[PDB]
Design an enzyme around this catalytic site. Structure first.
Site, PDB file in Angstrom:
ATOM      1  N   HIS A  21      -0.214  -6.301 -13.624  1.00 12.49           N
ATOM      2  CA  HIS A  21      -0.491  -5.557 -12.397  1.00 12.49           C
ATOM      3  C   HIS A  21       0.514  -5.886 -11.305  1.00 12.49           C
ATOM      4  CE1 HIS A  21      -4.419  -3.392 -12.833  1.00 12.49           C
ATOM      5  NE2 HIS A  21      -4.402  -4.092 -13.953  1.00 12.49           N
ATOM      6  N   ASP A  52      -3.123  -2.063  -5.280  1.00 11.51           N
ATOM      7  CA  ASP A  52      -3.347  -1.887  -6.701  1.00 11.51           C
ATOM      8  C   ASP A  52      -4.825  -1.624  -6.996  1.00 11.51           C
ATOM      9  OD1 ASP A  52      -3.848  -2.766  -9.540  1.00 11.51           O
ATOM     10  OD2 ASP A  52      -1.644  -2.796  -9.377  1.00 11.51           O
TER      11      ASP A  52
END
Lengths: 441, 442
Positions: B15, B113
């Site tokens: 991520h 994110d």
């Protein structure tokens, strides 16, 4: 907000099938008919939904002319029963109850679309009745788009109002409210007066519609980048309302003079539905005559032999557009309104604004932010009847008819708007974007 | 000028790296970008990657957000550290508004994110700061994540072997292909999945790691109101990749290999392959007789390396995957089928032999199968279901996979289209222009 990149399988597809549902009233019907035209124009087949039986026969006639004159359109009947007039306050707008009657009929619609071929790609619904149709569309997984026929400014107000509603009703009168995404903090008195009473039917519709629009597949709004760059930027960039769906600017949906020096004549029209006290109408006459500018007025109350004049007055309805675009005229004196700004922008005319009521204060802001209109703050609507005298009006006309700051941006507005309405122009790009985004492979 | 944008990444290299590439891309285009770093990261890799990046890239500024890690008494069922850190920084979101009070020039937007987004949306809205969710996975997983809340009861009560219709998605999804934790409503991942699927419609918009040539039907559905109602704008921001330049030659044997002859095999960071499965995998590469580079008693065996010395290289350590996939000598990518692995194969024009192990790897395999550039043999199961595949089977599939010339050609096509998207004034530049203009204040 400028056009999003164009992705398209230009390889092979039929034009999409779009159902369209208008709200009641010629002010709502005509832009919708233009929207539907604009879709049919580009090859979409459209199915127009009519409330049956119609509240107004004229409205149904307007619809008939449109389906007969344009080829890709089918007509579909939606049974609606009129609501009980006794439970509607007579002071409030008659059209409100007509909206509620057709909202009530949205459950009847989903069976009506089941038969339909080719399958629907989308339904477009006027904000004023959209809320219950949004739910119906969701059930049958049919993308639903809201048509908002008033300005991008009004749209931003209408979406932002629920999030600031507690602040509005907690405010003391004379307070100014900061609406998200809009730069100018604005006084609560500039809002439509009905909005200030939370029980009032206009408020209840305003919040309900403001809460419904975010549930849509997106919003098609009668505005264009050249006219409302900030409002449209804030709508497409999450500054009016978090989680807002895509917002597409879909506009614009639009003898004696030949003798006068160009830009010399003021064109004044307060409109079919104008509210002026007789004192106020008379003061307008005095001020108009005192100004010494050449002028054409669309409208006794004048005086006696007041037409011993270099000016002109007209009773009969006339196309504002032909005169506005005319070389002779250099100024537009009118009430505020999403409609009046748009035509002044196409006409390249500067705007002297006298707002009648309701949304019109807000439409004045649209002109003033561009730099093409002036609304003198004392020129209030007909509430408390503070009379505006002719002397003040005459000075204001002279000053307005000399203000080439306003005249220049209006002239640029005409050029920018003409480029937007041109083939390949901004408006075509937004319609091409919408058609492509709902078209299936 | 150009806007000031703040960016927040989620835990784990998978991520973090997208967010690094997104942030580099915004600085590339003259945005000044503030990289908000939850401290401390789980792993030293993440800490090192951040520091090298901000030091390496001029426009960026580092703003440390201190996050207290999840209490051990909290969610004890789940020992996954990266899953725990998702929960931790999500709980730290109220910290952020004091951190942003100082910042000048004023921020135009923040990008969060997806794994950590839900709470940070709510904080951003209170300070009236447009908040964009970065969905670092595919458009397919975004559609699934957005539609899962609406069909959750029908998923939870469906039987095994049942297929579920998700609104935006072209084909119905077998329940076995969903990420297994999703099947468990109590599971922390499933909790995050529902929170995130419900929070994303609240965002200013969604930036997705996808592009039209990779996922045209999912991007059309997302943009055309066919996956979820009230969805904010969805803009595909891919492709995003790192690679390297002005560097030494990593593996001269690979440079000495012939065009498209080497199978590159890698199963990622969280490889759940068993030791028994690893030895059978090694036997399969050996029995295939194909050239290969494979990055990870002994799991290989005795004398395996001497026997395979002319055609095989097995490396135990980190390797730049995007660099190897773009190498002219490799002709095949045998992969755990990650979302990021499938986007990288597409950039490099490599066909995929896919072995989905867990979670969303199954959905990624369908993205590649849909474009015809990948092959996931059914029967190559979840790691959690311990079915041991024999090296004799692995060898036959590898031979068939390296020989599928038609598979290779669509992978080559995909490379070409993806390269159009990267070219100047191509799709990607336009989406990035679009975002910057969307954000930019006059």
């Amino acid at each position: 907000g400028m056009s999003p990149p164009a992705p398209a399988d230009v390889v092979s597809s039929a034009k999409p099938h779009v159902a369209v549902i208008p709200a009641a009233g010629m002010g709502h019907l005509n832009p919708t008919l233009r929207l539907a035209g604009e879709l049919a124009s580009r090859g979409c087949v459209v199915t127009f939904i009519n409330p049956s039986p119609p509240v107004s026969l004229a409205e149904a006639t307007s619809v008939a002319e449109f389906v007969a004159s344009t080829p890709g359109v089918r007509l579909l009947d939606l049974p609606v029963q009129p609501l009980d007039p006794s439970c509607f306050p007579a002071h409030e707008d008659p059209f409100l109850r007509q909206f509620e009657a057709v909202r009530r009929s949205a459950p009847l619609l989903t069976p009506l679309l089941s038969d339909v071929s080719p399958p629907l790609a989308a339904i477009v619904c006027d904000i004023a009745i959209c809320s219950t149709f949004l739910t119906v569309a969701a059930e049958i997984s049919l993308p639903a788009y809201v048509f908002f026929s008033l300005s991008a400014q009004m749209l931003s107000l209408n979406l932002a109002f629920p999030t600031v509603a507690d602040q509005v009703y907690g405010a003391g009168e004379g307070d100014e409210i900061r609406f998200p995404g809009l730069p100018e903090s604005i006084p609560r008195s500039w809002l439509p007066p009905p909005l200030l009473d939370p029980a009032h039917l206009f408020a209840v519709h305003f919040v309900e519609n403001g809460k419904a629009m975010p549930r849509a597949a997106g919003i098609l709004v009668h505005s264009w980048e050249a006219l409302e760059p900030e409002a449209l930027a804030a709508l497409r960039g999450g500054r009016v309302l978090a989680g807002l769906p895509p917002v597409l600017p879909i506009g614009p949906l639009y003898p004696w003079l030949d003798a006068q020096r160009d830009r010399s004549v003021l064109f004044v029209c307060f409109g079919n539905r104008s509210t002026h006290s007789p004192e106020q109408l008379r003061e307008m006459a005095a001020g108009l005559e005192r100004s010494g500018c050449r002028f054409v007025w669309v409208l006794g109350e004048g005086y006696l032999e007041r037409v011993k004049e270099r000016g002109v007055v007209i009773n009969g309805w006339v196309d504002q557009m032909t005169i506005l675009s005319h070389r002779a005229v250099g100024g537009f004196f009118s009430h505020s309104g999403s409609s009046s700004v748009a035509e002044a922008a196409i006409g390249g005319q500067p705007l002297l604004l006298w707002p009648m009521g309701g949304d019109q204060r807000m439409s004045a802001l649209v002109a003033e932010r561009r730099g093409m209109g002036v609304w003198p703050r004392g020129w209030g609507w007909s509430a408390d009847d503070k009379l505006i005298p002719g002397e003040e009006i005459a000075r204001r006309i002279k000053d307005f008819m000399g203000d080439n700051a306003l005249r220049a941006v209006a002239a640029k507005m005409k050029k920018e708007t003409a480029s937007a309405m041109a083939p390949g122009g901004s408006k075509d790009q937004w319609f091409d974007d919408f058609i492509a985004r709902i078209n299936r492979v």
